[model samples]
Target: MSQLTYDDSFLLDGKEIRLLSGAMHYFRTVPEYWEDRLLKLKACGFNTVETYVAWNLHEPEEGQFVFEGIADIVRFIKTAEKVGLHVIVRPGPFICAEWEFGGFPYWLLTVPNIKLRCFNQPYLEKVDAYFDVLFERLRPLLSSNGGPIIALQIENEYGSFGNDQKYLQYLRDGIKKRVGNELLFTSDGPEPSMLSGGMIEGIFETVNFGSRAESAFAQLKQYQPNAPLMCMEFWHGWFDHWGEEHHTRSAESVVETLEEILKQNGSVNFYMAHGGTNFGFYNGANHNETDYQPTITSYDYDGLLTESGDVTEKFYAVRKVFEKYVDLPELNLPAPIPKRLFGKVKFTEHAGLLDSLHRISTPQKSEAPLPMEKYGQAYGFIVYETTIKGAYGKQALTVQDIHDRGQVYVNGEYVGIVERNRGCSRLVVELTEEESKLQIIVENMGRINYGPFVVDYKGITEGVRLGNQFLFDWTVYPLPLKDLSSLEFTADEVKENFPYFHKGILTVDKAADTFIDLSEWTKGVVFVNGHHLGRYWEIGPQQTLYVPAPFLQEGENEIILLELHKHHQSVTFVDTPVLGA
Candidate 1:
């Protein structure tokens, strides 16, 4: 049987090996292209491919486990193995990988008084339950069982959050109970307090940092004098938020650091060798101090591989750095995946969200509107409707604790938008009538993936206030938008700024990867052939949504967009992704 053991250095199958790995999340990239991405990692002189197991993707709902298509982590691991690369699995009950809810199932929020990433019994029980299912799925793939997966991470960057040694111990014991004799590790920032808080007695402690590899490893040496030095996440590039400038780290700087780590005989993993798409509403946000910014749809990360899986100059630079130390394969790098400019897709059909709510959502009645999680809804948009009495012109409409963004409407007329952390959560709407229809279409723009506010519940978590009066008797429509089969469309074009679904068709002569350019469109989500391509906003560092070839079929491909603000009559299919350009 294959085995991986560490003693001041990593030895796999009784031979010293530097685990040159790259992070390629399976949930982020389509499964059809897993082999291609892994091959690219190998071509870049990486011997291992690391991925985080998104607990949210595996078990989207409580007790409802899904392990097919993108969620088929086993297939992803096997694909990496076939590509001649070892695997490292970070099965985090809290991944904090800029993933929605930090890879936690939204239903976990439904659990009352549940504290996360700590010694809370409810949270630990949920973690144990998820591990029970996840470890079993990964058991056959462990290196001890002659599989490619060598090491599994217990919790992700625990020290950055809290100093809960008991919680870490519980996780260690639980993981050991499941996968016996398997290599276990913990990754944390290179800080004394972090190491002290995150370190376990017998597990390998690895540091994660982008630059200053010498100093990071030196810090690690102080803590673990005899342990092997490894940089768990050598950040090649940084992830971008919606309104911020797109981030990129220069190849020169990255290669310099790579050479530094290799010079120290330290193992390293690129934070994102291939940063893929953050499809659907799964893109997580960053909450720092008082500012909260949701991440862009693209998880491009500006790494060696682009979101479309195209290799960058950074790829060659890093590979050249590796060539100085290791003997790389003589074979040429794999050809770039074919991409086509499919031209404009005109929307001949449209349906406003308010108009089609009856067909798509089952309305839940409440005196006060509850958050989406309270109504058993996880992602996408939700509408809170009520009839306001006596309130006349110019009323202050405030949705207390509205998660992310919300679109206000009175009598089906679009009023304005209230975005969390952007500005005030209140908007003054002119009431045309004494008795008026009040509706607020709130979007769960993606939860805070990292920081103090990670337990992010979507929609209106609290009640609504209008003109110094607490509104009551509400009807909430939880539109998860997982399925849109019931959407009835009309030929007339929707030109208004109401959440509307626009339909179009792109006829494909040959199936290939393409990018849907929605620069003209405002804020909304796109679905190609029923696959959610994620949210796009005018406040973009990302303008085009990546469309994998697998999501397209030869012939008429159905394209749909749920335009939240205003509709763009057509969408262009371009060859290149326009991220922040």
Candidate 2:
């Protein structure tokens, strides 16, 4: 095999100059399954794989590195090479792929009044350290050094966001200094203005599009004539939000667009040839100039391949077209696996968690209130309790800075509600006595996706007071709910309404990838063997999380959940590995 390097034209491999690529992220799929996924990519007529090396996934904790298990990026790239696939590495210390904090770890936001992605000193220092560690592991595998890495991207899609030429140049120079001779490219939207602002001198330019391939390529060509044209993320299908309908494109339309690109000899990467699950807290939201919007957990972007790796109509459509355009060999796709069965167990209505809260005779208050995570809880419901001093019957109650969404209760009676992104709702409640208990249950709807508003807090960051005075004697309940098996429920007890922890044992004969439906439950987090399986709400669209068989034991594996609403009576297992509906 010949080594790979870029010339003024394109990547040189012996005498053939061609661009063959597919988008694959290591973090999206399990690392143990890297080879299988790569082989599948190759079988689909892909010769190159494109992926964004997520900074958050690798360096989750400050100064602490994690590249093992499902996040082993090095293993992922090398596995692709072993499977005869070239690699396009996008190591964005700031990759905005609809990821939480836009791929920047939450810890970065805790850096004391520090800005991100720009020339911010504290932020850039951390970026430098991340690159140093990553390159140390990745340097030996550059295509020029007899590896499969054909191109490396610096700061994805920067042109769409800002016109900071100095920042763009800084990123370009910074990366070149580290891996100068390796091929470099810049991915931007398929717009003229975006190209004008994002295109860098001497680096290949790529665009993102689902149609008008020639126009997109022309835009890049006009800006950088010497650079080869590529499309980093070509939309095959769109992603779904909470209340939105599932996005789908006609198979015929997708083929027509793909045919034009292939016929024109243009290089395009199907945005998600395979749309995987955004498991756990990794799901991000769209924070527009107005409000913060969270995306659904199922990232099944209506791709050619679904989240479970089953090829869809889109996949066969593109595959047939590619075979017509190029001399592609016959391929065999994986068959969908059969569904497993976990015998059902009825959950009877038991004493609610609110009843337990009332049993606390003396609840201590905090000098200064804090968010859910501060109380050792990662993400879930948090209850803020306080009592009013004077009797104010039927007075209006207000809470400022209720992150995302929450429900309000006064003296064990359901009062009103408040939402983060939508219209501001204020409700009137009747307080009968001087000492009235006020409980505000807040939920972390989701994290921000775009822009610098990620420092936003969840679950009543500010104190809740009646009228003007701060209510005295408060009790803060940190409901992290990591374990479900250990929860003890009482049969008969009378208390107010609140979310309760439900525990059950699911026995699986064989451990394999499966999706557990949580659509019935109102909202809360799920835990399997103490591993935080991520958050879930009965907010339609997102109904399941991709529970890998790797996490489950042989028999009688435990499943615990803290459900807010009791709408769905039972939780069951399905044959489908990915969540739909």
Candidate 3:
């Protein structure tokens, strides 16, 4: 095998090789299955594996780098090498992989008027600092250093964002200064204008295509004829949002495209060979003119390999085609684990979440009232609390920008509600009592997937207030409670109503992946072993909450849930893999 390096493009092992790669994010899937997934990628005839080095996952906390357990990127790369696969690292200081906040840490937004992914000094400085530490950490693991990394992408899909060549050059230089002219490439939409703005000097330019193998090569030839051709993202599968049906493409069509790419000696990378779960508020959105939409949590993406590392029919179809084209070694592929029986566990309400909130008076102040992602919280609900004074009657509640869905409560009484689908923010609520306590509970509806408006907020952007006046002297409570394993249930003392928390315990003979149905509960969060298992709503679509086996124990495992409905008292668990009515 010949060593791969930046600027060294040649035939691979006597064949005029075109690199066929797959974009499989490391942080999305469990770390224990990294090698297995890579091997699966190899089976699909993918010689190279590409991924975005998410800065949010690496430096989750400022100055703190986490590489242990599941968040280990170095191990992921090494494992790919161990499986005889080359790696393409897209270290995006800004990776917009349908992730919330565009993969830039929310803390970065605290800077005043900071422009992201462009020529902003403070933003650039932070990006530089991040690259400095990342380069140092990954330097020893480069392919030049006998590792699997072959190319490093500077800024992801820049052409889609801007047309500034100088800005592109600046980003390229930043990567070069750290990696010293190793394999560097620019990924952009395979359009004339996008390519024109994103192309850089001394670097290969790859296109993002939705299975147009011929068009990709034609664009590559037209733009950079002498350089090697590659596809940064091949949209084999699409992502899902709340109201939209799961996106699916014909398996036969996908296989046909793969065959065409290989037959033409062209290189390609599946945008998401295994589109894993967005898992928490890391899910991003798209913002075009006049529209801002957020993505759904389940990023199944109709991948060749499913989110759980299970091979789909597309996997087999692609693997069969690749086997005929290349001389590849055989490897064991694990069969999809059959959904097991855990017996039905009934639900029982133990406590309420709102009552618990009423007990804790002092709330923490945020830099600004942010959505679930900014507060380091994922899904569920957030409560913005405050006490009202003077006369209170029917008040026109005006939430400056109520993102998605939320309900209004005055003095612990349910007022009118506001929903995104209905397209209204102002509501008339009768608040009869004077000097009453006010709370606005907001629930993140499944995020918006398609269109330009991708950066939509989740909760009430403005506080709940009466007519002609903003609701002043308020407390903000973020109910993005992802982990419920460590919570202690207080004795039932306060009046239970529409929204409340439920706590319980259950024992199982064996530990495995199980789904907790939240169909009965209006909206809330579930937790086991202190691991937050995402959010759930009675609204149609996502009815199942995935409970990984890692969070389950053999004996009695604790489960604490905050349910939003008052009618449903008991909760039940079926042996099935999904949760719903």
Candidate 4:
């Protein structure tokens, strides 16, 4: 029987062991490349691979579970096991990895008076039900059950948000009650408040930091003196925001910090050995004291591996550092996946979103504006329409709380935009007639993934008012936009100011990884052969959206875009990513 234990040092079957783990998210990357990325991690002298199970992806809708495709976590773990690497799973009902709603299902917002990451019964009941399904799938894969999984995390970095011990205890007991204790632990920032609030009494404690491993380990020692020291999330590089500069750290600086941690005899797990794409609307946002900064589509953490699973300078540099302490595998590193330039795919067909609402979504009548969750929709965009009766010239129209961004249109004419990021929601409109159609198309940029604002609702969370007069009799259209087969696109060279879906066809001689450069396109999301390539904004630190090889076919591949503002007729496909302007 194989068992893992930690007492002053980690032990595997009663022999001393050191875990060299790298974070590789299954949901972020396609399953086709799982083995390739795992092999890359192993060749880099890592013995283990860590991943977080996103609640939102697994159970996208309440009681409705999805476990296939990229959501197939069991297959991911088995793939790592096949590559001779141990597995560490973080089943975060709340994983603040810059993921949408911090890995929480959006439907949870519809539950009345529900409080997240706390001991609230309504919230706990939902979490308990989700665990009932999640744990059952994880149980058979545990190391105790003759599988590769060695450790499971309770909740991720709980202390960074709140000090709810009761909430933490509920999650802890929930895991133990189902999985039979195969090595439970908590990870938090190195600060005392985070450690004290996130740690459970009997569970092992680990700290997460990018550098200064000595001070981080010392702090963990003060909390659990007898326990083995580990940095569960040693960030080698950083995630980039949409408008911020693409973040990077030199190979020299990262190697220096990594060596310092190993010198203290501490185990380490690079936060991201390989960073994949954020595909679709899964990208999350940060709510700094006042700013609402949403994350970009490319999660190319600027780590040891690029977004397309290619190795960087840090890979060899870190591997060189590991050779000083342990014997590395003599296996050859895998060949880099080829990326090709398929330049300037042109669009001939177009369909306006406002005009084709009937084709995409059915209308729901409401007295006042309701949120996306209330309509049983999770992501993408929503349309709120109403008639302005009895002309009131130049009235101040305010969408009390436009969840993220909204574009106003009056009688099919584009008025302006009111965005949540700028902290403004009011726009003045001129009503020249007695009756006019007013439409507000709201895009759920992303929900807040960290801090005290995890319970975010998309669309209009509050009611809409027109110059102190509340608007009523609204017709809402919920465009989840998951399936665009219903859209009737025509090759009718139409020019309009409203948001439109443009279609193009790319003839591929061979399928290879490529970056779709949308630098000329304004704000919008892209879809290739029905698979969402994620959002591309011209305000970007990110100018290209990564298109995996699997997403393309040998012949003609379909490319679609829902441009919120303006767009060029053609977009270029480059061999590399343009992360910044």
Candidate 5:
């Protein structure tokens, strides 16, 4: 094995190099496709593969760790190495990849007076423990040990957030203690926001963008003239939020922009060569004063590869531009995985989500509304049920501080939604039943993974009131839907309202990567076999959820859709994807 190394210009052994890497998250796709996707990246003539290790995915709880199947970063990096591609690892204590809690464990917020992305001891202790486990697995593969891991990023785009001098060094020291051989670096934007925060004196600097690649690098050159310039995350396109226009950076635009970056003669990592599905409730959110942006499930960054791993026009367009700068690999790309359209699916049995709360989730008693972290819950819906007595005749119910979107049900009747997206905090309902029970099912519509609102919490931040009346004795059910295999779907279900566990079966002779269309149905989360394929919205920019081929079998496949809102009674499968219509 040849040792991978980089300098001001960079080299491997004695040969000079201009690395071509592509971003591909392991947690996003099915594990079976690890080799398949890496081979595709290698076939695209990319010399390196870059990925961010989501802390929350692997270690959902503090002590517990999971690195098998989709959480297998070791297998992912090895697969890239096996395919003759070097690796660039970004193990962020915080990765603002439009990911939930910015890829942070929700349990972090439970720490007493906890602080994040800074030099807080409790937070740093957790980060250290996490790194200790992670680096042990990766140390064997560092470049100095003749392994494919060429470089590792300390913390992603810190300067874009704040200028914590001590925090950056703490992270650097923590990583250096474990990783002695691999080169360490930081990837921030080409602006002043990134200039000061993530700037460590000794470390190399790499900046990013799409259209103005040269300008971004020029700004980097101005910041640190002698530092080696690398276009870390070339954002080919932008991520989408619900109820917004689908974002697409055209193929012509991608090629034109990529060629401009080629002129710089440095390493480039396509932010996503294949933006796999967010899979599970792992999709994150972002915030500004005017924005409560929660990213859609389909991470298909509108890149070279579609969500299902098929090459797009952008792929060939990118390759055409690459031929001018890099030597063409005489390798044939892998055969496309065949996709089959399973027509309209039928739900055999329906289960009422609210009715069977006792069986599914552990009900916790709280005096008032508490965030999910307070109950040690990470993502997904949390049901807060209580009794609002002596309320009759046009009573107005208001949640003091709602984190995202929620459904309010008075005495088992659907009232209205308290949606944070539309700024609907208060719901006015006609109260006929005296001493009525109130249920507030809140879906963490992604945590603000991007901005100053990043220290965001979940569920009801404050108390819920009914016409100047405070409600309490809250029995909250933690509904982090990690397990769906034996969900009580075969039981009786409520057909009228939201939080319906709609179970359906699809019989297919041949199975592959197919899109389960959710256009007719309202906003909800879908699960294929047992795996959660991430969320879908009728307010789509993304309607169909990408189902990886490996997730399906030859015979009958089970599907469970947590239809939080409107249910169309049936859902269909299509051969191809229709992202936004």
Candidate 6:
């Protein structure tokens, strides 16, 4: 069972190993925090544990595949080798970790000349059928079958977006033709211009940062000087968006560049060491050259554990800088799981999500307005409707390229909000009367997992207008809210319109891991007891939406909500978690 081999110095049989890894993300933590976040990253002195292979969380659709609960990616690296860690797989046919399209699979933008991450033959046939079902669950966990893998990255930072070099040499010859060896690297970003399109000349080259690990491995020994240095991503903290501000960093200010990368023996990993919780709606958005941020369902990248997994002062300041170098022995670090404050949560079930939108949508008829995967729908909300066929007087309302949010309406009244990120795309309609209908619901607010807009295309992918007219057949309404138990409940409170579905019940005498205080509401989506607890917006950092106490039960607990604009008779529950602002 001798796998873990390497180049200049990590060779297993030729002996040299130094590893130390630590980037956790089994779909951002939860299968009861995967062996308690891999035994607290092996009691904080990590011996390896990187991860990222979220091809849309184990295939969100195309050829349907889900690694069973918490997407068990081989039960999170065999529970990081049952505690004694060692694994570095980065299965991203593109995983930028702000994750959504970076984990690629919005049905590959419904393919058709799709150019994602470069060389586009239908985007390498959806990354060769998603690396043939993720190398059949990573070929029995590579390390040459004994398992516990040992590095495997590839498409990720693709030289910070393009220098493709034959798509990084066809993802290193399709991952060494389906996992046959071990260490095959490329992590880009210590910039010597991203080491020439993110190196691949016979794999091996890591380098991601946060602090200047000895001048980024002294510029990676002037570019791969015979290999053997690892950084892979040491950004220990930072990732929180949603009207910004809440990104802290300091384990005693990165302990002097992590003790100068273990005093130059170099092998650092730490990227997240626990930043969990991007739960439902798969939180991911950011597209600058001026606006479109979106990510924030609490990825708590103020890591070293704390998104309720507790423990931090950067985990005892990196366990006092890793037991002052190795021999960290004394294991067992698990005392976090116990957070509940089920405070206020009202609005005893009422449905206005557009009067249960004909019982949760699915009515097609496009002529020039079709994008939510053209109709095979991807995730939540899409309502579009068109008419103005005869207009008059002041008219103006557009909805183009809205891969993210848009709420404009007109016969149902509420006309406003055409956001894609403060960029504004027209909205001043007032035809007053005359064939006036127009509707547009749109709201995908996710996708663009990272950089150069990974082929983004959701909601109203171009097709909607008013002034000089261009509105076509459009009646599209795929609103794939997945299933909130055909919600149509009503006891009468009245709010008529703009997406609303508020149910209530938070009687918990004991449930744990909770947070729903939408600081008195504005944006939408949240569910409990039917699961889905993501999204919330009064737009500050994040208002609150963690809710996991095994989705709660004992004594009442059921809180579902859709909101979309207004309606909040009551809502509460918190065991501390405002996640910024």
lDDT of 3 by residue, 1-581 (tens): 24544233445435566677888998787676687788888877788898887786777766777777667788888898888888889887667787755566645645666666667788778887888888888877776676677778877787777776666788888777776435688888878888887788767888887777888778877888876667678788887555556678878988878776767666778889987776655676664465444455566688888766678898878778777787766746655444445654544545555665544322655534455555544445777777778777777778767776667777777775776544477888776666777677777654433333433446766455578677665456665564343344654543434576666676877886666766666666666766666666566366766666677789987776666654354455554533112
**Considering lDDT, which of the candidate structures 2 and 5 is the better prediction for this target?**
5
- CA RMSD of all predictions: 1.3, 3.6, 3.4, 1.1, 1.8, 17.9
What ordering of candidates by TM-score runs from best to worst?
4, 1, 5, 3, 2, 6
Q: For residues 1-581, what per-residue lDDT tens digits would candidate 1 score against the true structure? A: 87788886888888999989999999999988888888899999999999999998988888888999999999999999898999999988789999898888999998978998889998888888888898889988988888899888888888888898888998899888888576899999999988988888788899999899999999999998897889999997999988888998899999889889999999999999998989988988888888888888898888888998998899989888898899988747777789999999999999988888888899999888889998889898999999988747787888788897888888877888887875579898887687999899998988888888887889988888876788899998989888899998998757576888999999999999999999898888899999999988888888999999999999999999988777667999999889976
Give the residue spans of candidate 2 off by over 4 A. 1-8, 288-291, 334-338, 343-345, 348-381, 385-388, 411-414, 451-455, 461-465, 468-497, 567-569, 577-581
Write model 6 residue lDDT over 1-581, tens digit each, in one string: 65766566776756777888878888776686688878887887888888888887777888888888888788778888888788888887778888767777778787776777777787788788878887888788787888888668876767878786887788789888888777678888877777777787877888888888878888878877877788888886889778788888878887777888878878788878787788778888878877777787778788888875777888888888788787777856878788867667668667766556668786788789988887887777888877775556676766776768788877778878787765587888777676778777888878777677567788877677775567888777787677767666877766644777878877877677877789788888787887887888887687887776777878986778888777668987878888778
Model 3 CA RMSD to the hidden true structure, in angstroms: 3.4
CA lDDT scores, all candidates in order: 0.88, 0.70, 0.69, 0.89, 0.83, 0.78
Model 3 scores worst on lDDT over the 10 consecutive residues at 446-455
Return the clash pairs for model 4, or none.
541-579
For every model shown, the clashing-pair count is 0, 3, 29, 1, 7, 5
For candidate 4, write residues 134-239 as lDDT tens digits.
8899888898889999898999998898899999988999988887547899999999999989999788989999999888988888888888889999998998
Weakest 10 consecutive residues, lDDT, candidate 6?
Answer: 490-499
Give residue 519's error in model 1 in angstroms.
1.0
List model 2 lDDT by residue over 412-460, tens digit each: 8777677776555456778888777878777776567566576656676
Compare candidates 4 and 5 on lDDT and give the better one. Answer: 4
Relative to the true structure, candidate 2 has a C-alpha RMSD (angstroms) of 3.6
| TM-score of every candidate | 0.98, 0.88, 0.89, 0.98, 0.96, 0.39
The model with the greater lDDT, 2 or 3, is 2
Best by lDDT: 4
- Candidate 4 lowest-lDDT run of ten: 489-498
